[PDB]
Amino acid sequence: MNLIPTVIEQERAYDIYSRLLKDRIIMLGSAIDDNVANSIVSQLLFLDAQDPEKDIFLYINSPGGSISAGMAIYDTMNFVKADVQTIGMGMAAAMGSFLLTAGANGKRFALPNAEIMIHQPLGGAQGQATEIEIAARHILKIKERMNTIMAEKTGQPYEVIARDTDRDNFMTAQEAKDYGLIDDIIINKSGLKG
Amino acid sequence: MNLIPTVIEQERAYDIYSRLLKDRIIMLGSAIDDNVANSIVSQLLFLDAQDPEKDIFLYINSPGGSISAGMAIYDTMNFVKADVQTIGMGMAAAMGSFLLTAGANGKRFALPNAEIMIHQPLGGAQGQATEIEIAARHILKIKERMNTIMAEKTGQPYEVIARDTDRDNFMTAQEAKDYGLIDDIIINKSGLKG
Amino acid sequence: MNLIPTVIEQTERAYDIYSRLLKDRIIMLGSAIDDNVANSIVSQLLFLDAQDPEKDIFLYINSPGGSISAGMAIYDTMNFVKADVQTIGMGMAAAMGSFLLTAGANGKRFALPNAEIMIHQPLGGAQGQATEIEIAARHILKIKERMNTIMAEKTGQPYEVIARDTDRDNFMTAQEAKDYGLIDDIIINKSGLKG
Amino acid sequence: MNLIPTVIEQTAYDIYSRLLKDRIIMLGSAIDDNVANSIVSQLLFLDAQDPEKDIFLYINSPGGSISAGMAIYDTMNFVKADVQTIGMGMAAAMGSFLLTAGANGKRFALPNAEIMIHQPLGGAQGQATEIEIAARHILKIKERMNTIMAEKTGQPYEVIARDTDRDNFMTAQEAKDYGLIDDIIINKSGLKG
Amino acid sequence: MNLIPTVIEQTSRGERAYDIYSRLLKDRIIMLGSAIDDNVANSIVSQLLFLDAQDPEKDIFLYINSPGGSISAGMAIYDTMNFVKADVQTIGMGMAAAMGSFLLTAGANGKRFALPNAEIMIHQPLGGAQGQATEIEIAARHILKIKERMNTIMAEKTGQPYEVIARDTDRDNFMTAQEAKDYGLIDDIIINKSGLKG
Amino acid sequence: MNLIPTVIERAYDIYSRLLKDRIIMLGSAIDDNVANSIVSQLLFLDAQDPEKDIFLYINSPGGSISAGMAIYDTMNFVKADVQTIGMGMAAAMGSFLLTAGANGKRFALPNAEIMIHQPLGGAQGQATEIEIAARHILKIKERMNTIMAEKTGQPYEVIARDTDRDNFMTAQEAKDYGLIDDIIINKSGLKG
Amino acid sequence: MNLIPTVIAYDIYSRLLKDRIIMLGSAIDDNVANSIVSQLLFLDAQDPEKDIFLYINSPGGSISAGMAIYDTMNFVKADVQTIGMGMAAAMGSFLLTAGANGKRFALPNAEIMIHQPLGGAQGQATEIEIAARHILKIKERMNTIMAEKTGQPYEVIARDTDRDNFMTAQEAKDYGLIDDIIINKSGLKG
Amino acid sequence: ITNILTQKLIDTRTVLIYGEINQELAEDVSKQLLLLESISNDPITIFINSQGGHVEAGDTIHDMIKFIKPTVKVVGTGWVAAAGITIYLAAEKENRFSLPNTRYMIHQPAGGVQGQSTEIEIEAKEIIRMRERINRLIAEATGQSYEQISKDTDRNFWLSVNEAKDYGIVNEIIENRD
Amino acid sequence: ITNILTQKLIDTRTVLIYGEINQELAEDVSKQLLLLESISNDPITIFINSQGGHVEAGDTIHDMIKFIKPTVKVVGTGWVAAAGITIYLAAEKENRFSLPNTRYMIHQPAGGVQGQSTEIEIEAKEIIRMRERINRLIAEATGQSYEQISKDTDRNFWLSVNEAKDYGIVNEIIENRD
Amino acid sequence: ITNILTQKLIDTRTVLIYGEINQELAEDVSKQLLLLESISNDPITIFINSQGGHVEAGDTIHDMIKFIKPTVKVVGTGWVAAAGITIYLAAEKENRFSLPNTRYMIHQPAGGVQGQSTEIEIEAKEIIRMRERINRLIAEATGQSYEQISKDTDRNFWLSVNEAKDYGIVNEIIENRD
């Protein structure tokens, strides 16, 4: 499409995403809707068999999205025999940040000017009383699950996480690295720096 | 839209869902409507007449869809003698969890932070009341069947499921296993990662 | 739209799934009977008359029904060609969607068990002046006439039992429809042997 | 969009081209310019490819404009070819024209289908003399349009100008006496192929 | 969106045939089977500046099946005809409108043809403006130059006097071809020829 | 989906083949999008033949003056020489764009239409918001109209009153007004 | 949009990509800058030393995605020569100043806009409070960077971002956003 | 007491037709007229500033002017149109006054037919007669040829006030109540 | 019982014309004024605040002021525009006062059209014909030279109330009822 | 008879500008103002809650009420906005009153333009005039300075109740009728 250039190499015919998938990168700079998961998980699940040893560099520039579609990604990202690297650039929101926090310890990285919206989940709920009552109990626990995993993955206290997530808080990179969301901010090429 | 990136293990420039097809995987991570069933029904028949022996890796991330459509899909799984490996990752729903339950016995699985809903058939009607009566009669048959299947596959009583599908029974898989919707969880990192 | 994957099996150039189904004499009537669809069907239907006017066609119906007139073409050509096709009820059929299923060649119309069949008087719409509605009345009435008169035959029922039960939408499974004679049998499990 | 099938008989072949390969032209839609812009272009490829093997024009149209449809008419007569015409299910204002436009002896249609004669569905706007012209202009359009319907049948004109007072719905068997179709399509005369 | 079919002839030539419109491009005929907007005329002009570089001696057939469109297209397609080293045949089929007839008549003298039932609608251009006075009086003075030129044009490509055309573009002075042939819009109603295989 | 045919010659489309002839079709508005395709084609053709002419055909009703200066600066950035053609209408950017071409082969078809115009714009906001929106847009209308005085060699103030309203023109007065160099008969002046 | 013409064989932006050139035209959505970082990094791999060119022709836009496109150029050690042509704004201009030092280029008639970013909120007050904090945090650091990339102070660029501001070409270089104004043979103007 | 004051508007025998001639207003006027019919025979005084509207009900006003007893001074003010001017010219010329600044307009009718060819000719057959009939009423009442009205009405033939007095549409360019 | 209220307002002989000049407002004004003439030849005071609008109502309402006997004092308030100022000017320039913060705007008439080309040729003829008439109408009731009016109305020429006074629009910038 | 008890409003002389300042509203209030000076020359009472809006109706009415004979007490409640603030500042400082839970907003004039840049340049001048004229007005009646207010009106400046009294918009925060 116009949104992407048909890269070609001389390597073979390609597209500006696949040719990164050749590099074992995935791109998730889009809001986490349902059909994008099936692309993310398939991409990742594919890279689990293509080589379960060469890590995956998961780029994230997201405004967040569905937990229900976001969680399969997490469990699958937890499944793989590889070890992924999560990379927060620009933004990672309510579900986006979660993956970034969920990345492998010593593999959750970020850019210094990226932003992280810790944020408890949002829920539409309608109908009679019992149904919203039921639907509340669900999303209630979904707030626990993500709290439970933030507290676990960050190794931080549960109640602290529920506190800082109630009011959607925009954390930066350094705050994240301090909070235990992540490990490091990426800087430059290594070596001679050139 | 953002495209579906292609894969570099591959004969050809396969879109990913065909590369997953070459793994005998099928991603039912979409709205279960007729543009999907006639794509999915085809794939099942396509794989069973290819190789009945290997499993069928039917992957679900459905937020639900029509009942008649998926009831076609269900009739195929029992039909084709290949063993349907239903996984519900992240989310299943009215026809979603139905399929996962209807998977082959000992061969339907899920993940821990996966989410599942089961309610009675959702729909409606309009027109003259006699013409409402027929619809209520028809949709009733859809209600009991989905309940009997949910009952007999899980082996729980029909009387229970008709009561528990009174609403949106929202579980993860663990209680659903104990509920009996499925057989096991398959997150497990499992030993030798080769 | 939903990206339809690609059938690897030809590697010649691996094509899509509905093209494979076409290669093996399957038609996937996977929508309502609209015009732009109905033509592809009739074109799909007539192409597979030339490759083998003996071998059957495997018509897989999943339809909410639709344009009665468009299907009425599809019906007639199905009687024209010599495939004498099969019609494999799945998911559901409806007002015209089922009529083609019944118009599958006699002794070849089958359907999955839980499939739902909505026999029905024709969808109808007529506006204008009264004399021009009295006109369109007769046309729809002639349609329901010649249609139901035929559905009587493809099931082999009388004409009044069937117009009666189609006075409203009547919802029947394959079995009860097979008992009514709309089809010839349910499918249960695979043709073949050992697995 | 709607699904296109693809066949493999040349390898990867599109189906409607395969009907074009057997000289079948498929009018499966409303007759807008962006279709007549092609349908006529299809015939011209076919009058070049072989102007002597017939065309088997497969109509299924609910009747588009006359402003484009008449292009298709004079086109059909203009080629050295003679087109056979087939009404799949439904033909209308222009449809019963183009079916009727076929070469004599070459006009057919299906048994259960229905075919509709129709005067010109019009429209006008503005000052009365602009109406009158764009009314009178429509009259002549109907007038010639009915004249063709008078000729391909051989019927008198008034009766056709009479029967298209409405949107009269004609079976093939009605058309048979009425001469729009030279016969009805049931079979390949018992031929097995 | 709907489909444009494919064809196979150059394949049989051993050269890989392709879509239909481009097949007709290879035969130097171009389809104006659309409402003549600006973005289409730019493609037509490309198609004519293309045939300018393939063979400016091998003629053009042109196909008008347009119910009309913008004036600014009717200029460029008209002006580029004058620019183009070749001649033009133009055939009016179906409908031709204010810009349709404008180019059909601007064809090469003796090569403006059409069909019997094909329709030819002509009139002064529509248009207008809104707001302040002087910018409307301006836009009133611009539009009039165009019908002036446009009617002045079709005086030349018809030989009729200027006045009668202007009178005859007071309204939608519709024409079928044989009438329009007498009016001098066209040169012949194309019927059939036997030489192509008898 | 719309009408774009392929060609006889390679897997080219119709506009693409004219690029091989160093020909650009500018058939619509000056939006940032098209001004990001058009600019690419010019920088492209600059490298394919930094000396051989390029033939930029305008048929536009105009657009963003912001993109107007990109395309204008672009032609003033490539080392090529440009043979620009006003056909149909070249309204309010098409015009001002056309006069930026090679001083001596700025082309225009005779009955084609031309239109000068102020840089249309607007603003909604506070006082200090809209005064500043008025400075820059005014600042634009100055330098744009200094330039049409340059390219035509006419006086600036004279261009001002001619820009004070819509000012429709033909090829004839336009050349005698200075907007172009030439009026184009059957391929002469572009014999290649 | 098949308007985007084929060239030689593939599309055109894919060629300029091959020439280490990127055409940031449209407004800056996530999915857009999702591809630019996909491009910049690709090009960084094909040569992590050879320069990269970049043509900004945008009205600016989503600040948050852009900041990655700042961080991208600061990670890759490829010198990223930035051209601000036609149009530059809220973020499109910030990128231009982010570029390679002395290789921040321009054209003489292009324009460069600068202002405090644009947003807002809806919710409770102490929720809307949070956005105001963060939305201040943006310009609190953005202007510092854009000041730093220019070397100008913060208080003065604050004033020039205290309200919408338009710069023409020569002033920007005189302000120090860009360092040069290319045109024919990259230096007929400069 | 504003009712007594609204009854004092009746004491003036003022009537206003301001705006679209349409059947929301005819009933608002024909009522008003029948009121001043029930009172007396002294001159009803109609004012107008009307851009026209549905003509064929506008003529009911024209009809009713003929219908009712009193003299009617009528005053075209600022603007009149097709549906409005027939009402103005429903008056006898001698009573037909107007203002200096008004610009009158006459144009032919307008139609919006759709449907079958034949049903277009029907409703085009009568608008023709309407195109005649109205042009008769204008022509006879301004003392002028049916042709000369028909010819100019090929388009929106506009008028100032003086041309309307040259046409005889007007008797006086009443500038003061004096 | 606001019926009794407006009788106290109607004893004011005072009038408000605020907003867009439109026909369904001119109806209630011509309603107002003819009642005031039905009452008396006593003075009338106006206060205006308008974005102009539909000229053709502003045309007649200018003429009514001229049509009738009473000496109509007026005041411009806040701001005036093209189709509203012609009312203000319809009073005599020994009567046209104004408030000390009004801002007066003029602009050539409100135009709009589509249709065939002659229908441009016609309507545009009447527009500039309107414009020149209005520009006379303004120039006269100002005492200002004609061209000086028709020059500035190339665009929305605005005026501070004090400028318009020195222009000749106004008599005096009234500030109190005193 | 209940509107004769809405006339008891006419006795106490209490008035309500509640809502968006717009021209039609000004008719409804200035209906009441001119109605009320006709009754007497006593202190008139106004209550103000306002999002503001079209400023010039806002500044119209300010001039209107400085212009009438009587004095006025004003009650700025809930809040006042940029357009509605000049309503407050028509009453003189010793008479202006307010409530404690109120607020204020003094944003410089929001505007909107389009078309030719020259035309847009004209509205450039006059909205600045307005931006200054408003600023002439406020710092005058509040005894403040031009530059000072101009800095606050660089934005949507706000005050709670007390800063306004510290600024002298208000003179006293009437909390009771006492």
Whole-number Å distance between alpha carbons of E62 and E112: 10
Residue F5 identity: P
Within its chain, how far is the Cα of I132 from the centroid? 17
H or E stretch at G133: helix G125-150
Nearest partner of F116 among F57, F165, F71, judged by Cα: F165
Query: Structure tokens of A36?
Result: 């994008």
Burial C143-162 (b: 16+ CB within 10 A, else e): bbeebbebbbebbebeeeeb
Whole-number Å distance between alpha carbons of H11 and F124: 51
Partners of F21 in the β-ladder: none
Within its chain, how far is the Cα of J92 from the centroid? 12
Nearest partner of H89 among H57, H31, H135, judged by Cα: H135
Whole-number Å distance between alpha carbons of C48 and F111: 57
CB contact set of J36 (below 8 Å; sequence gap of 6+)? J10, J13, J15, J44, J70
Identity of the residue in B7, B9, B91 whose CB atom sits nearest the CB atom of A68:
B91
Name the residue with tokens 């279709």: D35
Whole-number Å distance between alpha carbons of F59 and F89: 6
Query: Structure tokens of I1?
Result: 């019982």
Partners of A60 in the β-ladder: A28, A88
Contact B11 C7 (CB under 8 A): no
Query: Structure tokens of A19?
Result: 């040719």
DSSP string for chain C? -----B-GGG-----BHHHHHHHTTEEEE-S---HHHHHHHHHHHHHHHHH-SSS--EEEE------HHHHHHHHHHHHHSSS--EEEE-SEE-TTHHHHHHHSPTT-EEE-TT-EEEE-SPP----SSHHHHHHHHHHHHHHHHHHHHHHHHHHT--SHHHHHHTSS-EEEEHHHHHHHTSSSEE--S-SSS--
CB atoms within 10 A of CB G101: 8
Size of interface C-D (CB pairs under 8 A): 124
Whole-number Å distance between alpha carbons of J163 and J142: 12
Q: How far is CA A155 from CA C86, E160, G167, in A?
A: 62, 93, 50
Whole-number Å distance between alpha carbons of E85 and H61: 66
Q: Give the CATH number of domain F1-192.
A: 3.90.226.10
Whole-number Å distance between alpha carbons of I52 and I109: 10
Query: Structure tokens of D154?
Result: 């051989």
Edge-to-edge strand ranges of the sheet holding C116-119: C92-93, C116-119, C170-173
Distance from CA of H167 to the nearest CA of I (A): 18
Within its chain, how far is the Cα of A47 from the centroid? 17
Q: Are the CB atoms for C76 and C48 separated by under 8 Å?
A: no
Query: Structure tokens of J92?
Result: 């003189």
Q: Phi then psi for G182, rounded to 5 degrees?
A: -30, -95
Q: Are the CB atoms for C113 and C188 separated by under 8 Å?
A: yes
Phi/psi-derived region of residue F45, left when phi > 0, alpha when psi is between -120 and 50, beta in every other case:
alpha
Burial class (CB in 10 A: 0-12, 13-18, 19+), D105: exposed
Name the residue with tokens 């739902």: C116
CB contact set of A61 (below 8 Å; sequence gap of 6+)? A27, A28, A29, A89, A90, A91, A92, G30, G33, G34, G37, G65, G68
Whole-number Å distance between alpha carbons of E95 and E67: 6
Contact G38 A30 (CB under 8 A): no
DSSP string for G62-130? -HHHHHHHHHHHHHS-S-EEEEE-S---TTHHHHHHHS-TT-EEE-SS-EEEE--------S-HHHHHH
Q: Give the CATH number of domain D1-193.
A: 3.90.226.10
Contact C35 D29 (CB under 8 A): yes
B58: helix, coil or strand?
A: strand
Partners of D91 in the β-ladder: D115
Indicate the CATH number of I1-178 among 3.40.50.300, 3.30.450.20, 3.90.226.10, 3.40.50.720. 3.90.226.10
Greatest Cα pair distance in chain F: 59
Identity of the residue in C2, C13, C195 whose CB atom sits nearest the CB atom of B52:
C195
Q: How many CA atoms are closer than 13 Å to the CA of A169, on its beta-carbon side?
A: 15
CB atoms within 10 A of CB J157: 16
Q: Give the CATH number of domain C1-195.
A: 3.90.226.10
What's the residue count for chain I?
A: 178
Q: How far is CA B154 from CA B62, B83, B141, B146, B182, in A?
A: 20, 17, 19, 12, 7
Query: Structure tokens of D11?
Result: 């390898």
CB atoms within 10 A of CB J147: 9
Q: How far is CA E151 from CA A12, E141, E171, in A?
A: 58, 15, 13
CB atoms within 10 A of CB G122: 7
Q: Phi then psi for B182, rounded to 5 degrees?
A: -135, -175
Whether the CA torsion B4, B9, B12, B18 is positive or negative: it is negative
J6: helix, coil or strand?
A: coil
Edge-to-edge strand ranges of the sheet holding D24-27: D24-27, D55-59, D83-87, D107-109, D183-184
How would you write D38-80 as a 3-class SS string? HHHHHHHHHHHHCCCCCEEEEECCCCCCHHHHHHHHHHHHHCC
Rounded to 5°, angle at Cα I69 from I65 and I73 = 55
Query: Structure tokens of B116?
Result: 């599942």
Q: Between H117-142 and H55-67, two packed helices, what is the crossing angle to 10 degrees?
A: 40
Whole-number Å distance between alpha carbons of I124 and I129: 8
Whole-number Å distance between alpha carbons of A139 and A67: 10
Burial J7-27 (b: 16+ CB within 10 A, else e): eeebeebebbbeebbbbebbb
Burial class (CB in 10 A: 0-12, 13-18, 19+), G144: middle
E175: helix, coil or strand?
A: strand
Identity of the residue in F27, F111, F186 whose CB atom sits nearest the CB atom of E85:
F186
Whether the CA torsion D129, D135, D136, D137 is positive or negative: it is positive
Whole-number Å distance between alpha carbons of E161 and J135: 68
Whole-number Å distance between alpha carbons of A148 and A158: 6
Whole-number Å distance between alpha carbons of D71 and E92: 9
Contact D134 E34 (CB under 8 A): no
Fold of G1-190: 2-enoyl-CoA Hydratase; Chain A, domain 1 (3.90.226)
Partners of A25 in the β-ladder: A57
DSSP string for J53-72? BSHHHHHHHHHHHHHSSS-E
Whole-number Å distance between alpha carbons of I136 and I86: 11
Burial F173-190 (b: 16+ CB within 10 A, else e): ebbebbbbbbbbeebeeb
Name the residue with tokens 């009086």: E137
Rounded to 5°, angle at Cα H52 from H51 and H56 = 175
Whole-number Å distance between alpha carbons of J2 and A152: 71
F contacts of G21 (beta carbons < 8 Å): 43
Where helices occur in chain E by DSSP H, the ranges are 9-13, 20-26, 38-54, 71-83, 100-104, 134-156, 162-168, 177-183
Whole-number Å distance between alpha carbons of A11 and H32: 89
Q: Are the CB atoms for G60 and G91 separated by under 8 Å?
A: yes
Name the residue with tokens 């012609």: I86
Whether the CA torsion A12, A17, A20, A21 is positive or negative: it is negative
Domain boundaries along the sequence of chain F: 1-192
A137: helix, coil or strand?
A: helix
Going by their DSSP bridges, the two strands B25-28 and G104-106 should be labelled as unpaired
Identity of the residue in F10, F73, F143 whose CB atom sits nearest the CB atom of G85:
F73
Whole-number Å distance between alpha carbons of B154 and B179: 8
What's the residue count for chain D?
A: 193
Nearest partner of H89 among H143, H43, H132, judged by Cα: H143
Whole-number Å distance between alpha carbons of A142 and B129: 42
Q: Are the CB atoms for B136 and B126 separated by under 8 Å?
A: no
Whole-number Å distance between alpha carbons of C20 and C12: 13
Q: Are the CB atoms for C67 and C94 separated by under 8 Å?
A: no
Q: Phi then psi for G68, rounded to 5 degrees?
A: -60, -40
H or E stretch at A88: strand A84-88
Nearest partner of J135 among J123, J151, J150, judged by Cα: J150
Whole-number Å distance between alpha carbons of J178 and J97: 12
Going by their DSSP bridges, the two strands B57-60 and B86-88 should be labelled as parallel
The alpha carbon torsion through A137, A142, A145, A150 (nearest 10 deg) reads -140
Partners of D26 in the β-ladder: D58
DSSP string for chain H? -HHHHHHHHHHHTEEEEES--SHHHHHHHHHHHHHHHHH-SSPEEEEEE-----HHHHHHHHHHHHHSSS-EEEEE-SB--HHHHHHHTTS-GGGEEE-SS-BEE----EE--EEEHHHHHHHHHHHHHHHHHHHHHHHHHHT--HHHHHHHTTS--EE-HHHHHHTTS-SB---S--
- In a mutational test of the A interface, the residue from B1, B2, B17 whose CB has the highest number of chain A CBs within 10 Å is B2
E contacts of I120 (beta carbons < 8 Å): 127-129, 136, 139-140, 143-144
Q: Are the CB atoms for I76 and I104 separated by under 8 Å?
A: yes
**Least CA distance to B144: which residue of chain C?**
C114
Contact H9 I122 (CB under 8 A): no
Size of interface D-E (CB pairs under 8 A): 117
Burial J51-72 (b: 16+ CB within 10 A, else e): ebbbbbbbbbbbbbbbbbebeb
Q: Phi then psi for F63, rounded to 5 degrees?
A: 175, -155
Q: How many CA atoms are closer than 13 Å to the CA of A73, on its beta-carbon side?
A: 32
Contact I137 H101 (CB under 8 A): yes
Nearest partner of C73 among H123, A8, D60, E102, judged by Cα: D60
Whole-number Å distance between alpha carbons of E5 and C43: 14
Partners of G83 in the β-ladder: G55, G105
E127: helix, coil or strand?
A: strand
Q: Are the CB atoms for B40 and B8 separated by under 8 Å?
A: no
Supply the DSSP symbol for G49: S
Query: Structure tokens of G132?
Result: 């105001």
B181: helix, coil or strand?
A: coil
Residue A43 identity: Q
Contact E45 F26 (CB under 8 A): no
Identity of the residue in C73, C139, C150 whose CB atom sits nearest the CB atom of D60:
C73
Q: How far is CA H1 from CA I4, J2, J10, in A?
A: 5, 16, 17
I contacts of J63 (beta carbons < 8 Å): 77-78, 99-102, 175
J14: helix, coil or strand?
A: strand
Q: Are the CB atoms for D60 and D27 separated by under 8 Å?
A: yes
Whole-number Å distance between alpha carbons of C108 and H20: 70
F contacts of E31 (beta carbons < 8 Å): 3
Whole-number Å distance between alpha carbons of B6 and A18: 6
Distance from CA of A26 to the nearest CA of G (A): 10
Rounded to 5°, angle at Cα C74 from C69 and C78 = 145
Q: Give the CATH number of domain B1-194.
A: 3.90.226.10
CATH architecture of E1-198: Alpha-Beta Complex (3.90)
Q: Are the CB atoms for E116 and D144 separated by under 8 Å?
A: no
Whole-number Å distance between alpha carbons of C31 and C94: 11
Within its chain, how far is the Cα of E28 from the centroid? 15
Query: Structure tokens of C121?
Result: 């008087």
Size of interface F-G (CB pairs under 8 A): 111
Method: cryo-EM
Distance from CA of F12 to the nearest CA of G (A): 7
Whole-number Å distance between alpha carbons of E100 and E32: 9
The alpha carbon torsion through C15, C17, C20, C21 (nearest 10 deg) reads -160
Identity of the residue in A15, A46, A73 whose CB atom sits nearest the CB atom of B19:
A46
Whole-number Å distance between alpha carbons of D71 and D65: 10
